[PDB]
Scaffold this active site. Structure first.
Site, PDB file in Angstrom:
ATOM      1  N   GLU A   1      -3.119  13.621   0.517  1.00  0.00           N
ATOM      2  CA  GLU A   1      -4.386  13.216   1.183  1.00  0.00           C
ATOM      3  C   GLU A   1      -5.065  14.483   1.690  1.00  0.00           C
ATOM      4  OE1 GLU A   1      -3.386   9.831   3.782  1.00  0.00           O
ATOM      5  OE2 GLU A   1      -4.209   8.741   2.042  1.00  0.00           O
TER       6      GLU A   1
ATOM      7  N   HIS B   1       2.205   9.072   0.615  1.00  0.00           N
ATOM      8  CA  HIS B   1       1.140   8.856  -0.360  1.00  0.00           C
ATOM      9  C   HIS B   1       1.481   9.710  -1.570  1.00  0.00           C
ATOM     10  CE1 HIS B   1      -1.362   7.137   2.909  1.00  0.00           C
ATOM     11  NE2 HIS B   1      -0.682   7.984   3.659  1.00  0.00           N
TER      12      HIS B   1
ATOM     13  N   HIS C   1       3.848  11.185   5.991  1.00  0.00           N
ATOM     14  CA  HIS C   1       3.279  10.997   7.322  1.00  0.00           C
ATOM     15  C   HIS C   1       4.287  10.388   8.237  1.00  0.00           C
ATOM     16  CE1 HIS C   1      -0.968  10.825   5.447  1.00  0.00           C
ATOM     17  NE2 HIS C   1      -0.531  12.085   5.639  1.00  0.00           N
TER      18      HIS C   1
ATOM     19  N   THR D   1      -5.571   7.093   7.835  1.00  0.00           N
ATOM     20  CA  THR D   1      -6.128   7.238   6.482  1.00  0.00           C
ATOM     21  C   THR D   1      -6.144   5.975   5.675  1.00  0.00           C
ATOM     22  OG1 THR D   1      -4.133   7.921   5.377  1.00  0.00           O
ATOM     23  CG2 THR D   1      -5.440   9.670   6.430  1.00  0.00           C
TER      24      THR D   1
ATOM     25  N   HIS E   1       5.855   7.082   6.154  1.00  0.00           N
ATOM     26  CA  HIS E   1       5.525   6.627   4.819  1.00  0.00           C
ATOM     27  C   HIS E   1       4.967   7.800   4.036  1.00  0.00           C
ATOM     28  CE1 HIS E   1       1.776   6.472   7.104  1.00  0.00           C
ATOM     29  NE2 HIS E   1       1.234   6.913   5.985  1.00  0.00           N
TER      30      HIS E   1
ATOM     31  N   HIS F   1       0.876  -1.232   0.000  1.00  0.00           N
ATOM     32  CA  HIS F   1       0.000   0.000   0.000  1.00  0.00           C
ATOM     33  C   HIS F   1       0.883   1.242   0.000  1.00  0.00           C
ATOM     34  CE1 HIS F   1      -2.693  -3.043   2.140  1.00  0.00           C
ATOM     35  NE2 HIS F   1      -3.416  -2.719   1.065  1.00  0.00           N
TER      36      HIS F   1
HETATM   37 ZN   LIG Z   1      -0.390   7.990   5.656  1.00  0.00          ZN
END
Ligand SMILES: [Zn+2]
Length: 257
Positions: free
Chosen positions: A103, A93, A116, A195, A91, A61
């Site tokens: 996000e 996104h 994050h 999230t 990590h 992910h």
């Molecule tokens: Zn995150």
């Protein structure tokens, strides 16, 4: 079997994780015209001088940079927070294109990516207990825009080829997360959630106003990662972001005038 693909993405998560439609979901749009300056908010204290990264992981992910969280080594305090929160992992996104990937959004602006840094409240003893509490986690969120390279990211970028596919990990010691921070620690804060599933409403969000810049080359290497495992049909790890969720009965508070 959740993901960000055509049949299992964010819009489906509520079927397995009904809190997806909860009162305190993240991310959110930050409306800079309605977030009010709060003079009671303190400067953020980020103490990462002793942080000890150990490994980097493709979880299918995103990828996680992990830290040894068996002592106060890498802590967040101050800001909106009471007490001390210990760094466990970071990590990102990111998007398929530079015009999406974050996000949180700022007046509906999407950044190319969002970092994050996840921390757990030491009063709850471990991460797993912390996520069961409304004040269990503090996540520092940092926007990424494409422009200049971030030299402090290059070490991450260079290891990604070894963790191409889900399930792969690699030793990753001595990585200094201070090299991922912007100059200013001005922030917005609000109560919200993880999230990704399980979407638990355990997070004090601290989103920095100032983005970092990374180069197009750096982001391109993110986009070569795969959501699949070794030896399965290739699906590029892109667009691994959840869209903004309703703010509901929350206020976004600014640390700065
Ligand atoms: Zn995150």
């Amino acid at each position: 079997h959740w993901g960000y693909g055509k049949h299992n993405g964010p819009e489906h998560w509520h079927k397995d994780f009904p809190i997806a439609k909860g009162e305190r979901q993240s991310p959110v749009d930050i409306d800079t015209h309605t977030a009010k300056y709060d003079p009671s908010l303190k400067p953020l204290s980020v103490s990462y001088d002793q942080a000890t990264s150990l490994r980097i992981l493709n979880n299918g992910h995103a990828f996680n940079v992990e830290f040894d969280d068996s002592q106060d080594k890498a802590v967040l305090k101050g800001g909106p927070l009471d007490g001390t929160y210990r760094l466990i992992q970071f990590h990102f996104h990111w998007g398929s294109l530079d015009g999406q990937g974050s996000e949180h959004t700022v007046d509906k602006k999407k950044y190319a990516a969002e970092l994050h840094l996840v921390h757990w409240n030491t009063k709850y003893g471990d991460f797993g207990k912390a996520v069961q509490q409304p004040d269990g986690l503090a996540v520092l969120g940092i926007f990424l825009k494409v422009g200049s390279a971030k030299p402090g990211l290059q070490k991450v970028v260079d290891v990604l080829d070894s963790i191409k596919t889900k399930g792969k990990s690699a030793d990753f010691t001595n990585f200094d997360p201070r090299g991922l921070l912007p100059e200013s620690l001005d922030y917005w804060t609000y109560p919200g959630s993880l999230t990704t599933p399980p979407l638990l409403e355990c997070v004090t969000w601290i989103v920095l106003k100032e983005p970092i810049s990374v180069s197009s080359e750096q982001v391109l290497k993110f986009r070569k990662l795969n959501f699949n495992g070794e030896g399965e049909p290739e699906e590029l790890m892109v667009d691994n972001w959840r869209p903004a969720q309703p703010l509901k009965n929350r206020q976004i508070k600014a640390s700065f005038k």
